[PDB]
């Protein structure tokens, strides 16, 4: 039956560890995925790591019922800093049950509906800011739409206001996230021969988690000072009982599981966000359409939550946006048992399978000879629908099975909210018409150096 998986070679204590860029580890993954194809083999420190790149491979290795999310390399690392909280737990850790069971309920579409009205707070911040700011004023791209998603997902969730639109520097907690993310996989990549040279990379990285425990502390601390009679992700953490084990979170699973939210419940948003703007502002036949429609269907009356679903030519775009640009690129799965895939790989129990999204994303043989192009014409529920009959998992930017983003229908609302508030209100110009897309790698991806302008509508 089985065929040997090709792959780089390696070197003597090393394998292929050295050969990841420091500052962009995707590109690595990308390269070798153009040079040897849907599989291949990498030796990291973690262990032998296999690299699946299409979409027959991802869709077979979709199946829970033959594999599952290990949490392994730079996700067993995040573990430091918030252990099995809901992200990072293993499936037989019985935290992961209760943290699941206890916080579904909160992302429900009554209680997500229920949040519109704080997202749209958030999103006119931003907009003021922009309007008051005025053309002249470049605009950080991924600095105000980082401001824009930790504050929504802090004000629905927790009731916290970071305020970041009256503050010039991001709060502490977006540095601190942004190296211990990085680090978190630098460490994971870091060959034993090589990892004494690392003592100050050391300290930073525990100093790091500090801030994001102490943040979290002081969200928490907020709660006990100023109770509410609401219901959200924090009231169902403290009040919450699992009826499945009899249990609540203790405290420190509460700071895990807020560390987890105020991360994964921001980061890949203002990815998305960041990376949806540059791509309309290029391709300005999608602009216009994104356009049109806003006009069409809200024209210049007010943003309701009934508009969400009424917008499929910005659905499509978010939809193009995290097929270019997954941002959670690679998810894990590993193999319940010893394993065969593509019925020709062999494939070991507990291995370390790397599902390339930013590849299986591009696989010609679904999305044509245009798959590397930005086309939302081909996202549209027609056709998205029909790409999905015929190649299951073509699309996977928001994970697989039980493990797949609990967080979805809060990302989903909030981005075609707030694109069709800034397209409403403003044009939009790249600040640097030579601007070229350049990727910053904090394990998740935005766009690095892009800055627009915004200018009012008449
Ligand atoms: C565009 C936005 C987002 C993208 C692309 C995204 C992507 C993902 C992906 C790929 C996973 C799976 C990780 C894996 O398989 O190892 C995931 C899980 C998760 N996401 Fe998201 N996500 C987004 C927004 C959010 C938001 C807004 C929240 C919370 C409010 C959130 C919370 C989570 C959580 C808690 C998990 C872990 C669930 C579990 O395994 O039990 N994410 N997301
Ligand atoms: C708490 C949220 C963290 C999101 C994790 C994203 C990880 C993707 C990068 C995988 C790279 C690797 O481990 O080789």
Redesign the pocket.
Known sequence: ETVPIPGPPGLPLVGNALAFDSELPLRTFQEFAEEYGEIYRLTLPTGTTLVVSSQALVHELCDDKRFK?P?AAA?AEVRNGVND???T?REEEPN?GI??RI?MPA?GPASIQGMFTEMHEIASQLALKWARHGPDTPIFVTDDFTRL?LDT?ALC?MNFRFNSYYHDELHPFINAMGNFLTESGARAMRPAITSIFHQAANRKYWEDIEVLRKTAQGVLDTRRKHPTNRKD?LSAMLDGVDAKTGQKLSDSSIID?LI??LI??????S??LSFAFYLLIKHQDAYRKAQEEVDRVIGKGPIKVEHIKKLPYIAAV?RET?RLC???PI??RAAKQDEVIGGKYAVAKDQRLALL?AQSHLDPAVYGETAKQFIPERMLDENFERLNREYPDCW?????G???????P???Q??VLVMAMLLQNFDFVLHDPYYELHYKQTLTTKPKDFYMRAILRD
């Open positions: 999310k949490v996700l909280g809901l992200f737990a992961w943290a699941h916080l992302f998603t997902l969730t992700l599981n987890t939210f994964a419940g921001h980061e890949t948003t990815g998305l978010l995290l997954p941002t959670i998810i894990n999204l996977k930017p928001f994970g697989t039980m493990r797949a983003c609990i967080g979805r809060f990302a989903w909030e981005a």
